[PDB]
Design a protein around this ligand. Structure first.
Ligand SMILES: CO[C@@H]1O[C@H](CO)[C@H](O)[C@H](OCc2ccc3ccc(C(=O)O)cc3n2)[C@H]1O
Ligand SMILES: [Cl-]
Length: 150
C-alpha cells in the first residue's frame, strides 16, 4: 500500500501530504543520522507557513546530546505545549533508521526499526494535518504513505 511522495529530499524538506491522515494511515520515513547531528525533527503541520509558523500537530524530535532522547510536542499559534519526553531512544549518530508513524483514532503510534518507540495523543485533529516537514541534521532516503482510504 506504500506510496512515497519523495526520495533523497534536500533537508529542510516540506511537502504536501496527498490524502487525509485517516485512522490506519502509515507514514514511513527511511533515513540516516549524520555523525555530527545534535537533533532533527519530523513535523506534521497544518500548512507550510514560515511567517507565521504553521501549527505542528505532531513534532517528533530525536535529540542526540548525553544519552539521547525523543521530544514530542504540539505547536499551536506559535506556542509549544507540554513536552512528552521518551528517554528510551533507538536513534544514534551515524546509524540508519526506519520510522513508521501509525495514525490511530486518538493518537500516533511510532515504531523505529520495527520496535515500538512511543505514543502521542492527538492535540490537533489529525484531519487538519496537510503538510510534512523534516528539519535539522538528518539524511532522508524516502518518505511515503499508506493511506487507509486506499
Ligand atoms: C526546548 O526548546 C524547544 O522545544 C520544542 C519542543 O518542545 C522544539 O523542539 C524547539 O525546536 C523548534 C525548531 C523549529 C524549527 C526548526 C527548523 C530547523 C531546525 C534545525 O534543527 O536546524 C530546528 C528547528 N527547531 C525547541 O527549541
Ligand atoms: Cl486510539
Amino acid at each position: 500500500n506504500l506510496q512515497n511522495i519523495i526520495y533523497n529530499p534536500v533537508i529542510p524538506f516540506v511537502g504536501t501530504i496527498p490524502d487525509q491522515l485517516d485512522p490506519g494511515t502509515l507514514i514511513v520515513i527511511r533515513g540516516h543520522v549524520p555523525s555530527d547531528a545534535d537533533r532533527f525533527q519530523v513535523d506534521l503541520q497544518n500548512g507550510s507557513s514560515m511567517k507565521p509558523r504553521a501549527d505542528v500537530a505532531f513534532h517528533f524530535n530525536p535529540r542526540f546530546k548525553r544519552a539521547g532522547c525523543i521530544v514530542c510536542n504540539t505547536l499551536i499559534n506559535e506556542k509549544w505545549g507540554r513536552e512528552e519526553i521518551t528517554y528510551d531512544t533507538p536513534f544514534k549518530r551515524e546509524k540508519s533508521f526506519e520510522i513508521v508513524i501509525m495514525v490511530l483514532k486518538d493518537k500516533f503510534q511510532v515504531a523505529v526499526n520495527g520496535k515500538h518507540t512511543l505514543l502521542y495523543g492527538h492535540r490537533i485533529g489529525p484531519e487538519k494535518i496537510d503538510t510534512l516537514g523534516i528539519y535539522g541534521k538528518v539524511n532522508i532516503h524516502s518518505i511515503g504513505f499508506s493511506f487507509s482510504s486506499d
